[PDB]
Symmetry: D2
Subunit: 237 residues, 4 copies
């Protein structure tokens, strides 16, 4: 079973499995039942921005989601990633739909990871920035229904040619190269991710959400993880 | 008076004004009496590295000081900088000696500040990195006994030609350009500073320490700030 | 008697002083009479992007100006900056209008300067990025009619309250901190500048242009350098 | 066959296949017979630094190799990479030994690639920096005799326990993720690579050299490319 650490932008509330009674953002550590959440005033049809940050000194994972001229939603949680994730991982974006749908369009995504070992200026780093996605994005591993190229955007879940979202869809996009997230000999290790999305829904209550996640290198979409499971978890435990 | 926020690498314990009975690192908010401190195993004659970080989401200021092949001292403190510092500040390094002395050599210094406002990828940033200092460092405002050029280093406090430290010396070096540390319309604001130093001392107990600070633009060394005041405070209150 | 090195986005052809008989971009070394130019299909009312680059290895200064879904204008020129500019300079943007006007709006501006001396990874660098300008931009030195704040933009030349550009106007904005552009002991020295502008003109032929420039630290707008002189030169020599 | 663009630090002169009669640095475009070379005063036993740069505006590939306190060798060549390399490539380091040997130790390696298309601040970038290599470097694809971990360095060619180099050895190390080197809709595309090496040789004339290269994603060591072929070319055409 995959080891997952994710920050979810949960648009549909599934109270039966622990979700709060409204759209929210949460920090999930190995389970879809968020260890911490915050109310999120999702704005249907508007481009928003998510920013995730973490550093080994504070051992605190935080996320801020906001829309232009609007209050931002903030969530933070104390977690020592050394004891949760393996040394090498893959980072990515996941999204899903179930009975209800929504577009899970990613317009830009950037990631920076830095490791500082016990030495002078000896800092190892990885940084990638996508402000436009091409049809053949060789450095991205697309899983499920995720596709790129449509107007230079990344569509995590299935969308029809006329532009409408489909139900029962799952898709992920992971950066090709493995990332060295931590090391026992690192004085300081830190990462930062940012991505802009566009969640549009024609129906009543949009579903299900988008999630930025970190996982074991060989992770793949668990079978039957559409809907509430966000393409990350095998069950709702 | 000046508004000061600093991270001190205090080498001499002044128990009468609140210092712990050993060398330590501390976080000072408008007072030399550190709001929080941590034991620091200072290594006389060795080059060490200090790393300070802060972000508006966690509103937590942290510092890590370490020497190659040795544990690192860490100190953190929750503080909302919007309520302590003016919108525009100047960042710098300060050091002093009193009855006892030590060299306060800075071998490198780097700083990165980022402000993200309510817009797409509209991030304002400033970054400077000095790995060598010249005799005529036009982008540094030197105050007190601070000088540059000797072997490409920055000597905060007075050192004679033969290479030995002088007592009752104070010196600071501030980056020329003002830094926009925070803004009411910022989704995320964060900064990071790093510097390597070399504290060498002929005497028994070295004194007094080095400090990375942030202050009002027009700040200058308070009178009598040699010794325990680290060139930052006018009194010990 | 300022030393000026500039890349001009010349909107009005002043053939009496050497201009080609059409809008163009040019590389000026100490004189308004460009050492090299290239035809530029200026698009009234549209946001464009200028990108300037230079490195001490090739000792070649190049610039590219372009608008979306349009051909870009390119101009390059071989010049050893060590022999033209002082070691320390200030970088900035300049603009002017004469009998004819146009708005000289700057929507963003970034600059990166790197110096690599004779040592291991010993690189000195400076980088600043403005994606939004505030009313009180303390890190910018505004000269002439230049102002900031209007919608988060930088208006190099005077614009009335309704939005119409004014004739006979000059404005410049220089980054506060001096920049160490070159050093005799540098293995590699290089810089890069990028800025987006919006030139709008209600009249027949727009005038006069915008220019990215590098100068001696104490430079200021020369007397009567409105119009064709772009706020950079004292005369048309 | 593979498409190769490389910058070689050739330590052994093979006059028969076109090499100058002294150690040199050269730019190879699809052939081991450099399109341009420059004399290189290789210093056996000392750590050196290579720096490669290129940009689509000047369409010029340049390299600078140097040792602390010594003049540097420089070589440049005009080449439009859009017409030589496929859109997606992999970048790496190669080295080989033949009848004669030398150690081809890489102590650090960094690369930055940027693509700016017809859009506002829409820049795609990739950057990685290794200042230490681990035993299990998951983001590197090691080919041939290349190994990592020995004192935190990357040994491109076979070396023994006591530290001496072996003859008839070839090794390469490519960054895991493919790199989007150019795009028809890019206003500016550029890259920069830097690496520090240590060439030590106990015998008469060291051989054969180190090379930084760019190739088609699926490139692999051609059969019998030890010696003068540098693990890059199938023959000496
Ligand atoms: C076709 C498909 O892709 N199927 C996926 C599947 O998707 C799930 C599907 O769920 C539809 C409904 O399923 C159940 O009936 C309920 O869970 C229902 O949720 C509402 O009711 C439950 C129980 O009463 C509540 O706990 C839950 O919070 C929710 O409440 C409703 O919330 C709205 C908004 O707040 C409110 O306005 C309503 O009043 C409130 N209803 C009530 C009665 O109070 C589901 O709607 O589609 C969902 C949305 O797309 C997914 O989230 C579901 O997962 O999932 C499985 C497993 O993950 C997958 O394998 C399958 O392919
Ligand atoms: C010349 C100059 O620049 N003067 C500065 C001046 O510098 C100060 C000066 O202080 C010297 C001594 O001053 C007092 O005598 C004491 O504060 C003494 O400190 C020891 O004693 C006090 C009081 O008993 C203790 O509270 C304090 O912790 C310290 O204790 C001693 O600590 C050592 C190490 O742990 C231990 O080995 C001893 O056993 C212990 N002593 C006892 C009795 O227990 C000072 O030494 O020089 C200092 C060092 O350079 C500075 O830190 C002082 O600031 O400062 C003023 C005001 O800031 C400035 O204006 C002036 O120019
Ligand atoms: C009020 C103010 O700010 N004054 C500035 C002043 O600004 C200058 C002013 O110039 C206006 C005209 O001045 C002269 O009459 C001419 O130079 C004229 O330029 C045209 O004519 C000359 C000479 O014949 C040509 O060499 C030149 O290319 C231009 O040609 C005309 O171009 C258009 C477009 O291509 C074409 O359609 C016309 O047919 C063609 N005319 C002819 C006869 O062929 C000036 O227009 O305003 C200018 C524009 O705003 C500025 O560029 C001028 O500098 O400048 C001084 C000194 O710099 C400053 O101190 C003063 O305050
Ligand atoms: C074991 C192995 O890995 N083999 C590789 C193989 O490696 C090659 C091998 O070459 C050894 C010698 O091979 C021939 O004898 C010559 O090419 C010789 O080179 C010298 O002589 C030629 C011809 O006369 C000159 O053109 C050439 O420049 C060189 O000149 C000598 O240079 C020195 C220094 O300037 C000077 O002092 C000498 O006087 C001068 N000699 C003369 C006669 O003038 C080779 O030495 O090992 C080499 C070094 O390790 C490799 O570079 C060779 O490639 O290569 C093949 C093909 O790539 C590979 O498949 C095989 O596995
Ligand atoms: Ca949910
Ligand atoms: Ca003290
Ligand atoms: Ca003109
Ligand atoms: Ca050779
Ligand atoms: Mn949830
Ligand atoms: Mn203290
Ligand atoms: Mn002109
Ligand atoms: Mn050669």
């Amino acid at each position: 079973a995959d080891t997952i650490v994710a920050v979810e932008l949960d648009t549909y509330p599934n109270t039966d499995i622990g979700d709060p009674s409204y759209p929210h953002i949460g920090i999930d550590i190995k389970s879809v039942r968020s260890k911490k959440t915050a109310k999120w005033n999702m704005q249907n049809g508007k481009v928003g921005t998510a920013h995730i940050i973490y550093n080994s000194v504070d051992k605190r994972l935080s996320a801020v989601v906001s829309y232009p001229n609007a209050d931002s939603a903030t969530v933070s949680y104390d977690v020592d990633l050394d004891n949760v994730l393996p040394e090498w991982v893959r980072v990515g974006l996941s999204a899903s739909t179930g009975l209800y749908k929504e577009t899970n369009t990613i317009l830009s995504w950037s990631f920076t990871s830095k490791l500082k070992s016990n030495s002078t200026h000896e800092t190892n780093a990885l940084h990638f920035m996508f402000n436009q996605f091409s049809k053949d994005q060789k450095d991205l591993i697309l899983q499920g229904d995720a596709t790129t190229g449509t107007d230079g955007n990344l569509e995590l879940t299935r969308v029809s040619s006329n532009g409408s979202p489909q139900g029962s869809s799952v898709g992920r996009a992971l950066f090709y190269a493995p990332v060295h997230i931590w090391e026992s000999s690192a004085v300081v290790a830190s990462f930062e991710a940012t991505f802009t999305f566009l969640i549009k829904s024609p129906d009543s209550h949009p579903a299900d959400g988008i999630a930025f996640f970190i996982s074991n290198i060989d992770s793949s979409i668990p079978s039957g993880s559409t809907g509430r499971l966000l393409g990350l978890f095998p069950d709702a435990n």
